[PDB]
Amino acid sequence: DIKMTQSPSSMYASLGERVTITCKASQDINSYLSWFQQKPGKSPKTLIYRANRLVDGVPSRFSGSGSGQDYSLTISSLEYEDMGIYYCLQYDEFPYTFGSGTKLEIKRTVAAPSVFIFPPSDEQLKSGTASVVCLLNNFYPREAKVQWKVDNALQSGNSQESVTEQDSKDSTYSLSSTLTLSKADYEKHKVYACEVTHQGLSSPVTKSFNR
């Protein structure tokens, strides 16, 4: 099958910038490439077909070019509505195959997270489980690392996290990490700490509590 290598996998850009996304095929596809845009929870929409033909109704700021094995999609002057994920697709030979996508987000200033730790409630303790939650609020850019330590022992395998999409008012993210323990294990240790590593931080921050 033809492999389509799309780049970059993600990028932050400001309004007004010229954005170029590339796609390289493992063999010559003779311009039989299409480009698509998809927004969270919505269907992809076709932007370009046969490498450089604009779909009726798509704004003229979108254009594609290339031939042989190398192609690119260019947005001449970025607009807020262009945020989302873009995919290339070759339909030169079966099976038709897609690039792995490019996530386009809005660039803003670095901002470190405010971190908070929350111990399990006694109400939950009753049930027989303890969830310890760590919150990293309003940070940028996305990349961040959370490490759980119980009485200094590092936890792995027993935590899950989720993150919000960029905020419409301030373009930052928020994230939560939940550490799950048996009521028993929880009762066995003392010191519960959440260490957060992020660009915005000159040094790794720790929030902890006892019992």
Partner 1 sequence: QVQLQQSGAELMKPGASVKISCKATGYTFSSYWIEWVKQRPGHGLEWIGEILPGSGSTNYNEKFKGKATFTADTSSNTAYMQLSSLTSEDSAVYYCARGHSYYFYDGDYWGQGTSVTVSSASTKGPSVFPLAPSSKSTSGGTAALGCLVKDYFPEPVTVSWNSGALTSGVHTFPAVLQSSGLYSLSSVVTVPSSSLGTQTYICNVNHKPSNTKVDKKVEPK
Question: Could you list the residues that contact partner 1 (CB under 8 A)?
Answer: 34, 36, 38, 43-46, 49-50, 53, 55-56, 85, 87, 89, 94-101, 114, 116-121, 123-124, 127, 131, 133, 135, 137, 160-164, 174-176, 178, 180, 207, 209
Measured from the CB atom, the residue of 17 and 91 that comes closer to partner 1 is 91
CB of 37 to partner 1, least distance (A): 11
CB of 16 to partner 1, least distance (A): 28
Measured from the CB atom, the residue of 15 and 191 that comes closer to partner 1 is 191
The answer to whether 83 touches 104, Cβ cutoff 8 Å, is yes
CB of 48 to partner 1, least distance (A): 8
Measured from the CB atom, the residue of 14 and 100 that comes closer to partner 1 is 100
